Structure 1
Amino acid sequence: FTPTPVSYTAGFYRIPVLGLTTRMSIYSDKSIHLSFLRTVPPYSHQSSVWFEMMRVYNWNHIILLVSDDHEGRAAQKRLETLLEERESKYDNKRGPKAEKVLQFDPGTKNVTALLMEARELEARVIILSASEDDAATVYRAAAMLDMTGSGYVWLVGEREISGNALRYAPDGIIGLQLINGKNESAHISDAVGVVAQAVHELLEKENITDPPRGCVGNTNIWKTGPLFKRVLMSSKYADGVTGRVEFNEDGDRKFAQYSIMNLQNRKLVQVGIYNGTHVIPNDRKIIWPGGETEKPRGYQMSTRLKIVTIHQEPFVYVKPTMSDGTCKEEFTVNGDPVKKVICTGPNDTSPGSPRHTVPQCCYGFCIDLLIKLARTMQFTYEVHLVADGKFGTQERVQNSNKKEWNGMMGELLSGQADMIVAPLTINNERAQYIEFSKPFKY
């Protein structure tokens, strides 16, 4: 907050000021500060360069780890907002969408509960925007819990390519960097050129008649502060240390230029030159982590599944195991072998009572349908019953106007389950939350 104590003062009377070094996003809002005019694009915007990477790497599935504060808040806001393009009347190209955006807590020394529930997802790219304390635990976690395996693709912001992070930096990570970086001097010339271009335009109106000086007595917003600020932020020149220094819709340095660096296991090395859409890799070889060199497809479609199903006499019977860890065979009227699959039912004893997640081999009719499908589409599965014990409906919890899902439908839309096969109806209301097959018995 080293720039604040002056952003307020001349903010009173609304005297415009110019920002040089800091790059946090808080100072951008038009409601908390009427004073900043930013020469260095703040860390927020650098999200889009990743979206830009997506147009030449196609890893449409994607994981995000926003660290929870206003800093990361804006990062999530912006990245989420990027996807809203492609009205689709082109004609329906595959649109990259964010997967489970696992949020965070800044001051935390154990993240193990986050990575396995992350590693067991469907994607293979990691975009971590964070701070310097954060990369420490992030790396010291991922590099040891069997996370940095090959096929993993990483990205970070400008604040993770340095600090203690490098002193725990995993291989092949990728960073972002502006062409300038820090410069206590160069942008000064740029800014005074801005104010120059502003002055000789000020004569066009010059109805200000003063910016009120003196301490006491002149307690009135100078009636041309905002207008002169619009003027200043509307200053167009093209010759400083960077060309066409512009001011954004919110009034920030528009169209700066980046260049995608990279760590060579002990050495940062530039690869490309990022400029709006101008992002081209220079003379080098983009080496990817986990000991690999080909462009890795960020998707790994899984073959396992977890399927839940209900208890029902004509479709899915339930029988306890034997008395040693087995369960008993049986044949048909034609003596045909009927299948039986191991079933981890959490309901060894009835409701209104305890509940135990004992195995209890279960079979039926839809069981037969499932096994028929398995040999047809190269599957492998593990089955278990429903915790609650009813089809599943809508309701209102907290005895308030809330709305969610009970039963197996809820055990699925939780993200817990993965596929549902049982005698489940097909209504209208339950359609707007899920996709259904074709029908298989009227």
Structure 2
Amino acid sequence: KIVNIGAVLSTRKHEQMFREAVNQANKRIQLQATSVTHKPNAIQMALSVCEDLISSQVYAILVSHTPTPVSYTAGFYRIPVLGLTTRMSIYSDKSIHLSFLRTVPPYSHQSSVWFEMMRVYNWNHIILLVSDDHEGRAAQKRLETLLEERESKYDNKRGPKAEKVLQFDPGTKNVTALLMEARELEARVIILSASEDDAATVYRAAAMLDMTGSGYVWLVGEREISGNALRYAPDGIIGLQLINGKNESAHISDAVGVVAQAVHELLEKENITDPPRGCVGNTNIWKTGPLFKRVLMSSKYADGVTGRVEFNEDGDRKFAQYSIMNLQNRKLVQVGIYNGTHVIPNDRKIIWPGGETEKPRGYQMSTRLKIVTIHQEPFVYVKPTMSDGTCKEEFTVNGDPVKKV
């Protein structure tokens, strides 16, 4: 038969690469390809996709770099949409979008590496500084999703716990108060998940209140070791890196094999209906939308650069492979590789914070406690002081002294 697939990218080069890549596994039901350019002024954008792809008999749409309307429109009609570039954590909403099946896992996922590090370096106390638009709300949610685990029915061991969760505001000018109320707690483990400015005005704020000396620890996210995250970065930082990278033409080929491994499952002749051409009122829609999607998100091995490309229980890329990154005061340098269940550090120098080559404990138990009491005559007497500032001495009946504070 005839089957069409379209895409809205920014490089004419990959446009030919996509047709070539589907033509490759085509030999291994004619499966054709379509594409359309990209433009600014996103208002006009949805006045392109419908007339350029729904005019065809599409069964997916591919998008790359911007969160444009191509998420909503083709989501109406419930035609599965495949994502390449962006991975803000907002697209996981089953209810908001029934469109995205994505390739680059979302920021909020990167908080599974962290819960691993806290078992390969044995830190059981943290301080968390989430952001306050949406991503943090998500990142914190997924992190708390793990730390609630390990509920002890291993075999009577100690487990991590949260300590304080400060929530600053996405647009901030003076933020030291949160830092001031942070050092008062015990630990020295900081997890800063925020955006570029949202880390510049924290890096430039924790070294001037001396929150980056020895015994300190920082785990960050890829947007926080990025670009303007080097003008003030804390030497001795720890950041992450995924081995897929932000390469457009990296896995378009990988995506092709996902629908390829699916058209032969769709040729089950149970009930198939074409996607209707034209954009003028085929009001209700069923392209086996739920069914065709249920096909796609069930173990389609992407013919691509990464092995065993699966689809998580929600629709985002599963089983990625990260590579633990680290800075020594100027040069962000690999120190490891993270692979699903494989936590694998490399062999090089981890100049920990402060330039002290120890593996500092995430703990500093305080001394100067604070106590509270109430006047009670047999137990706690209350008497004014002497004028000088001390208060009067005294001996008991046997003449021994009496201890006042």
**TM-score, reference length from structure 2:** 0.81
1:197·1:235 contact (CA, 8 Å) conserved in 2? no
For structure 1, which segment, 121-130 or 87-96, has the greater mean C-alpha deviation from structure 2 after superposition?
A: 87-96
2:258·2:303 contact (CA, 8 Å) conserved in 1? no
Report how far residue 286 of structure 1 moved: 1.6
Question: SS at the partner of 1:274?
Answer: strand
Report how far residue 217 of structure 1 moved: 2.7
Q: What is the CA deviation profile of residues 277-318 of structure 1, one whole-angstrom value per residue up to 9, with x for unaligned ones? A: 211111212220112001111111122211111121211111
1:158·1:175 contact (CA, 8 Å) conserved in 2? yes
1:310 corresponds, among 374, 379, 385, to: 374
1:136·1:168 contact (CA, 8 Å) conserved in 2? yes
Q: What is the CA deviation profile of residues 192-244 of structure 1, one whole-angstrom value per residue up to 9, with x for unaligned ones? A: 11111111211014622211221123100225111111111224216411111
**After superposition, where does 1:127-138 map in structure 2 within 5 Å?**
127-138=191-202
Question: SS at the partner of 2:369?
Answer: strand
Q: What is the CA deviation profile of residues 241-268 of structure 1, one whole-angstrom value per residue up to 9, with x for unaligned ones? A: 1111111111110001000111121111
Report how far residue 185 of structure 1 moved: 0.2
2:302·2:308 contact (CA, 8 Å) conserved in 1? yes
1:126: which partner in 2? Answer: 190
Question: SS at the partner of 2:192?
Answer: strand
Compare relative contact order (CA 8 Å, sep 6+) and give the higher one, 1 or 2.
2
* In 2, Cα distance between equivalents of 1:280 and 1:266: 23
Identity %: 100
Question: SS at the partner of 1:269?
Answer: strand
Report how far residue 269 of structure 1 moved: 0.7
Q: What is the CA deviation profile of residues 37-89 of structure 1, one whole-angstrom value per residue up to 9, with x for unaligned ones? A: 01110000100101011111111111111111211000010101102222422
* In 2, Cα distance between equivalents of 1:98 and 1:333: 52
1:153·1:173 contact (CA, 8 Å) conserved in 2? yes
2:390: which partner in 1? Answer: 326
Question: SS at the partner of 2:393?
Answer: coil
2:321 corresponds, among 246, 257, 275, to: 257
1:30·1:250 contact (CA, 8 Å) conserved in 2? yes
1:155·1:174 contact (CA, 8 Å) conserved in 2? yes
1:194 corresponds, among 225, 245, 258, to: 258
CA separation of 1:311 and 1:4: change in aligned 2, threshold 3 A: farther
1:106 corresponds, among 162, 165, 170, to: 170
* In 2, Cα distance between equivalents of 1:189 and 1:206: 29
More helix by share: 2
Report how far residue 4 of structure 1 moved: 3.9
* In 2, Cα distance between equivalents of 1:75 and 1:5: 25
2:253·2:303 contact (CA, 8 Å) conserved in 1? no
Question: SS at the partner of 2:163?
Answer: strand
1:198·1:235 contact (CA, 8 Å) conserved in 2? no
Report how far residue 100 of structure 1 moved: 1.1
* In 1, Cα distance between equivalents of 2:303 and 2:375: 75
CA separation of 1:17 and 1:206: change in aligned 2, threshold 3 A: farther
Q: What is the CA deviation profile of residues 368-403 of structure 1, one whole-angstrom value per residue up to 9, with x for unaligned ones? A: xxxxxxxxxxxxxxxxxxxxxxxxxxxxxxxxxxxx
* In 2, Cα distance between equivalents of 1:208 and 1:3: 31
* In 2, Cα distance between equivalents of 1:208 and 1:235: 21
Report how far residue 94 of structure 1 moved: 0.6
Q: What is the CA deviation profile of residues 123-159 of structure 1, one whole-angstrom value per residue up to 9, with x for unaligned ones? A: 1111110111111111111111121110001110010
2:107: which partner in 1? Answer: 43
The number of residues matched between the two structures is 339
1:212·1:222 contact (CA, 8 Å) conserved in 2? no
1:18·1:36 contact (CA, 8 Å) conserved in 2? yes
1:169: which partner in 2? Answer: 233
1:96 aligns with 2:138: no
* In 1, Cα distance between equivalents of 2:354 and 2:198: 22
* In 1, Cα distance between equivalents of 2:315 and 2:70: 18
CA RMSD across the alignment: 1.3
